[PDB]
Symmetry: D2
Subunit: 484 residues, 4 copies
Amino acid sequence: PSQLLNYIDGNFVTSASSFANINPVNGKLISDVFEADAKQVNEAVVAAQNALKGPWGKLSVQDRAALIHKIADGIQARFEEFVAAEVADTGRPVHQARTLDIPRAIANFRTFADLAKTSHTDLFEMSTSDGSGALNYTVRKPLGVIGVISPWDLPLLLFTWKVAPALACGNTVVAKPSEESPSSATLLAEVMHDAGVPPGVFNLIHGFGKDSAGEFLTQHPGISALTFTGESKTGSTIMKAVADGVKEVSFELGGKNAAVVFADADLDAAIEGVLRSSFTNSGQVCLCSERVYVHRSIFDEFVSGLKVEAERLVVGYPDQDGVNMGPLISHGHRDKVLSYYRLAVDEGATVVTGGGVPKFNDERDQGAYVQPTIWTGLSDKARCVTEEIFGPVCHISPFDDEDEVINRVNDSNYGLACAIWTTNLSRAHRVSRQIHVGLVWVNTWYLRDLRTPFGGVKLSGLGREGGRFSMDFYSDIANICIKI
Amino acid sequence: QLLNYIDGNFVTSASSFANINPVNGKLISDVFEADAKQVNEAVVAAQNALKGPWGKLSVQDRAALIHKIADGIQARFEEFVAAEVADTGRPVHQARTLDIPRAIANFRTFADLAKTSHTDLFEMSTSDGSGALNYTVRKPLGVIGVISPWDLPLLLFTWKVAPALACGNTVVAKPSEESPSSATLLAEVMHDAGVPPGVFNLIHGFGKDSAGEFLTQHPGISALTFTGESKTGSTIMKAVADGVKEVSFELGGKNAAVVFADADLDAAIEGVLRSSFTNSGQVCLCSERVYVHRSIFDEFVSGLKVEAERLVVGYPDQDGVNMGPLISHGHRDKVLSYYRLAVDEGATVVTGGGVPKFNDERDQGAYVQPTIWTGLSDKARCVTEEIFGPVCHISPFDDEDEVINRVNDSNYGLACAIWTTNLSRAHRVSRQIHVGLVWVNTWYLRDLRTPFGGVKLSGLGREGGRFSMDFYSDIANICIKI
Amino acid sequence: SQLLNYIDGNFVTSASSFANINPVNGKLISDVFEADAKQVNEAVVAAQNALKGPWGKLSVQDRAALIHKIADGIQARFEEFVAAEVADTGRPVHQARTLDIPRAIANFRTFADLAKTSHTDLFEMSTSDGSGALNYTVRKPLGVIGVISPWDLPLLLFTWKVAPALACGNTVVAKPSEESPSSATLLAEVMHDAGVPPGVFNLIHGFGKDSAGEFLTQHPGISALTFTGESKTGSTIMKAVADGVKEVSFELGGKNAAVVFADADLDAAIEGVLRSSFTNSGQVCLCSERVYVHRSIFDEFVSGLKVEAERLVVGYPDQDGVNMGPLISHGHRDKVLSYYRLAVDEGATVVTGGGVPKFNDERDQGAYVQPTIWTGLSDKARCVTEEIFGPVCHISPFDDEDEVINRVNDSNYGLACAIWTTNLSRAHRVSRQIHVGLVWVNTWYLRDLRTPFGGVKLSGLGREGGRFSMDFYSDIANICIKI
Amino acid sequence: SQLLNYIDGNFVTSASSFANINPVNGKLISDVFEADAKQVNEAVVAAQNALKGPWGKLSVQDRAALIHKIADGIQARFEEFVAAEVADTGRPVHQARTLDIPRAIANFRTFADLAKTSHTDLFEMSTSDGSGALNYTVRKPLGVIGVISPWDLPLLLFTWKVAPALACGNTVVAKPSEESPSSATLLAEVMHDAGVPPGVFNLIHGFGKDSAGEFLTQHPGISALTFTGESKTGSTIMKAVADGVKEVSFELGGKNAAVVFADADLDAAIEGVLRSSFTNSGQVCLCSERVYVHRSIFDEFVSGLKVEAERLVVGYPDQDGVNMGPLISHGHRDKVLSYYRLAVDEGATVVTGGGVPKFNDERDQGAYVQPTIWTGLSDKARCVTEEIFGPVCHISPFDDEDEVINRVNDSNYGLACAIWTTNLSRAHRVSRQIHVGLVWVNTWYLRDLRTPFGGVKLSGLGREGGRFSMDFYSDIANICIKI
Ligand SMILES: NC(=O)c1ccc[n+]([C@@H]2O[C@H](COP(=O)([O-])OP(=O)(O)OC[C@H]3O[C@@H](n4cnc5c(N)ncnc54)[C@H](O)[C@@H]3O)[C@@H](O)[C@H]2O)c1
Ligand SMILES: NC(=O)c1ccc[n+]([C@@H]2O[C@H](COP(=O)([O-])OP(=O)(O)OC[C@H]3O[C@@H](n4cnc5c(N)ncnc54)[C@H](O)[C@@H]3O)[C@@H](O)[C@H]2O)c1
Ligand code: NA
Ligand code: NA
Ligand code: NA
Ligand code: NA
């Protein structure tokens, strides 16, 4: 049907082999995607290094920012095409693509263009023995060639989350989107081309990880940095792969995030919030809550309430009326999720709702759907309470005491996000600062200010991105000291 | 004898190893090597200390306690001088003016930064019209693993330790096997200042199959900050990858100095002498490559030769001394093998090129002579590989763009010194040098607030000023929906 | 027994003297030499000259080191400063030991630290010729700072201005309140003993109009006038420096509210408002003289506050369990009593106090009044709108959140506000809507010295504290290099 | 042609009208309605009210998008705006196309972007009970900003104040110079067409004393007065707002120096000084009217400048290769020629110019003068010390670096300075010692809108640009939460 090409040194190019892009709604072939080989990857990196010496490297910060705004304009002008591309690849509801995914990708470019325009560096004066003094000033320069490897849960959002600041800081890019979701990135390349981004500045390579484009990219000595969002295990692998070149790295990895509902929470608001934090994108967001802790005094009522709301969720077509949830990304991912559904029963869970796959009795039965699922009854040590499942599921457990629940939230090798529900002023601030995660929300979930630092602790990440943190990571910070 | 310091106690080990004075090859002390069991004990005690009295100090009180650590060092100044000198053979004057005062400055400066540092507040609108607040907070990262080298032992040791403690972390610190004494005195100051048990832990030993490796492998740490060789950095980066530990690396360099035709020539010769031979060339920041404009080349080399030959090589306390020995015999071996390699590569030996004769104990030491080469290609191994001795190669250049390209044609990128009196040239050329630090008309001048680090193989991340306050802290974002 | 000026490194007397009077008993405690215009000029000129001297040559590190020595010198004479503050003001010894003196010391240490750690900015830009340019900023001393301070927190407010002034490398001509000259004089001594170069810090005594205060504000030799005191005086001063376009920084009056919502920790709010209304006998610019309490807890709040207010021990600064000393002066008490009288005329119910206590001893010769609580006045009453500056508050009920926000903001002042509530959204939602420089939630007068401090409307001009002081007390210059 | 006030979303006329006069030929350009006190009041009330309308409800993001639309509206009418600026002032068309109009558009865009990216501060602190506290700051609109602007760079300086005011969520009552009312009026059209809510931006026309300008500064309804103009006028406005303790920001006069050191690129310095003395016919606050040149190159410098100055084309704004239009007005020319005579009387050597060109056409009815260069005056001459605001410079030799620094600083003004040297150390060492707000090395009037801008001494009060504007045009509030 469609073909998704690579984009290398200003041209769309095919490849020797291609792989299948499968619509998870109905199991059908969407497109063939040409897999970049090591030769093509090297050509992309070499093109990126050279482009640093071309027109791009000569642009003022203002001209660079203006061009980046043009990239955003071009996405905006093809908004519905990008919507259709994200949807076809992932089965996400159209409304979500229209309200979250595509706007945020546009916003990624604008915000970092803006940050680039307004950012400055530092001036330090000092005295010296000869009483004449000295000046130290800092400058931001492009780091060089940035390798980008991105996942399939929020394909264009996370892809642009990395590409936007990379370009805003004057770097050049070689980027490999998830093999599960390569469409919107390919459209982005067309927008880059049409906007007049110079050849070699942005390069798109398609492929898998190991023994494919992903691995070839991480191993190339020509990149200056590798920014990556994905599985924790994959982060470790990549970190080993770039260690010999001491490449700069930035990792946003797994999580087993908790939501906590205190007895003084607005209960209806918390039920709705947790529904959202557990089942958005069918539980396929790094930020989703797979552990929920609810005060003993409201536990039964919270659980009954969430069950009803979960069962009201419409699981169906992306453009179906009132749809809330699409399928999982792939049959392969469904197999992982269902084996955890199985594991939970074996570990002693009560299945409050879901626990299987919906039966549609139409073509969607050939897709990769599962049911939104709630468990109770597992110990804090259960595998299903400790390992990231990355599906539409949450286990819910009671607690009695604030310090107790804080300790249970923190008792994890992960540390990405946490959502806390309480109407109490002191409790909100006191509790939040004690959660060992990069991001806490109070009385909401996944509310984003793009200027904030974003990242995780422990196995969930290395480094911070967002705002000035991206401006620092994607730049060479250099100190120049002048003796006066 | 030098003991480990673990959970408030000085403890011995099943193995000890020799601390050899490099001036005369004499034994200074036996050093107990921490085994894996003891490294685990240091790490567990570090973790627990976070939950004790240390973790409950206000920022102001923490900073006060840190200023007390600095006072402790100052009150035992000469004792610290003596330890640094003994281990390494550095000139007494260098220790008194550079090494020890900087260590004190390290603690004081980061104490001050901690007291005055703040974070950010972001306001935003939301659909419902009520809005939201996002604010950031800096928390202790947790347990910081510190592994440090021998060139500037106390300075570099405390360059990591001070911000780590100022940010409320606890520390397991492993100083170089070549220079364990001043770090052991520090553990004494820490103890006498009433730093809670477990907050600062000193473990002695080597790298592979030793305390260093054991530290980097321990899942209980939250970060590893390292200063040493590039290949060691790569190794440690691999070691901590499975736990995805935060890392900060300051690694090797092959730094260049550049003398433009319009430089103040006498100041340039003096500056490059300092940048080449300070601490006997054993500083990561030393210039081992020098580029001089063709029109002043011969005059420069002659002038440098003379100055280089007036340098006094001898006892650390021998009045007028300029250079002590290299850190060790093993290290002199490496340096001498490079001395041979330069000749085999076709170098003219303008001066030095071997080892001085003393006819006393110093011949049992590990001395070499300050050495200057000319006549090698940019691709010669002695021009590209870090020697870490008191040596430089000098090469003529003709064009500005030429010398910039030649400076950057390196797998390293730590620092560069440039000499010129021209305003435009100074700033135009500076911004093009692909390194972490550029000095103009000076060398190794340091403001502790500035970002410090290297690019390419010379490092990962930046430390100093807010970059240390950021690295040694968890930055967390809290979002309140209103 | 004699308080001298400190000019160009010398303690000097003056032509005229005035009486420093203990408000506990009305007894003369010292004679204070009033600086005339000639001595004021001499002080400014000496401060100008010191800029060109060793002080101008100090590195920021060295300067900060010396400022810490000043702090050390206050610490070493801690109890004498306490005695000095107490003697002049009648404030409880406990307050002087825990609030007044330690904050003066912290003032010097904090701004020395800020000076040591502050840096400025680098901006890169592109140029037509493609070579680019660099813009960088530096902080330089502004010059000579004229400091004028009030009597409510004498040493705290005096050092609140002098510390950053000196931290930024300025020289200083400072004029403390006629009512409280003692601690400033001891501070001169500490400067002297610390070896602060002559002319760097100059202390002139006197009054305002037609005296040392007036003369300083009109001297063309100063680069800036920072002032804390009455709003009308701020206006006067602003006109006086106009011809010179001097930099100005004003912290002026207020009529601050406290608001207690139905979901507040009622016991904590009662204690809180008690502190906010009667601390330093209600003689702090930040004090709450208007209080709004939700209808559902009004009666219970007023009853609880009455009991606590009546438990307050009014007496000698070193009297065991003392909570309140006297007002600053007999003249100040006469104003406060004229307001007590006015409240009654305006129809107030006097919940407690409303007059002066009878001690039957020397205190009856001093300047005491009772802690006083009113109810029953409308928002337009003069006792509800004009700053009294005594140990008093009016309490009014309210019903709605938007209502009480409007009544708080319906004022020509806008210094500070305290809000009591346990609700998270309300705390943040209400706080941001109060038109003042400083809001506290579930506390009062908690100070982080890094934060901007100041008022809006008639309560001020500019901000001080942290980065704001480093900016105000500095010349910020941009240097632009074409490459 | 006719220029109306813009109030509460409506263009309105007035009882009084005055003439807009083309300085090129003395012809009438338009009539301008002078707003009276009633209308100024109407503007301020409208502005106050608009704070409570739709404007006050916009998110920072949406407010910023609107401001970008304002900039779009000026871009869409670019040439009309060029025509207006040129007509009012006689400035070269080229300068209006490359400096004046583009900077106005950039002003709005830059502050819109600053608003979008700016954040405030979070301070944590410990407390006695061990639970801690949070201090956070927020930026809120200050309120109604009164803006009063001069005629040297009409739209640039007008929008330099209007853009940050609107970006910080304030509402505006703005009074452009009587000499240059056109572009501001066209700006009102752009705002209207972009759908800026009524009352958010108000335009009042008139003069100073007994007119719109004075009335604006006296109105108790404004929250701040930002002003650019003569030093004396700044002093007057500062007195006028003092009773309200209104926030103030002043960018005032200057008598700026250029310094040419012996190691300067001589040709570049000659060209640079020519630009800095004669651009906009010397009618820019940033122009150099004093020039110091090292003795060794003095004669060579003066000769070169004389020749370059005599090659300058003085004529029509669109004339081929024109360098200078006329002065703003015959009245201003009268003042300038008065200074031309005075210099002769003070004993100056007129190196070039010193009179008015003879055109033999309609330009003879205009307000032209010749670019003029003087030598031989002492540092104390009136012509070397008072701001002339015409196309003129005096040149004097110096021998020593410390000497010339002292001579540059020996002034009651302190706006800007341009320095010419090829030496690295000297550029940085000398620049930091010059007591002005802005120094340029090897260039002049190079602007980065993020930098602090302002002057010292009589040249101003406070800073604007970048974070400094974000601070001046906002209420900075501190909110302290006890946890
Ligand atoms: N970039 C900088 O700022 C900086 C500063 C000083 C020194 N250096 C570099 O340090 C080097 C010289 O010092 P060095 O010889 O001690 O370097 P090194 O790598 O051999 O040793 C450094 C430290 O790491 C430890 N170590 C060695 N192997 C280890 C391992 N496998 N696991 C854990 N720890 C291990 C050592 O015991 C020692 O404490 C030079 O390359 C020099 O450039 C760099
Ligand atoms: N906003 C704040 O932070 C703050 C802090 C403390 C006090 N205050 C205010 O201070 C007032 C009480 O103190 P006060 O009675 O001493 O006020 P005041 O303004 O009458 O006197 C203050 C100082 O200014 C001097 N002074 C008086 N007239 C002067 C003049 N014409 N020119 C120059 N100096 C003059 C006085 O001698 C004294 O030193 C209260 O209104 C209180 O709110 C405000
Ligand atoms: Na797919
Ligand atoms: Na040794
Ligand atoms: Na008194
Ligand atoms: Na006109």
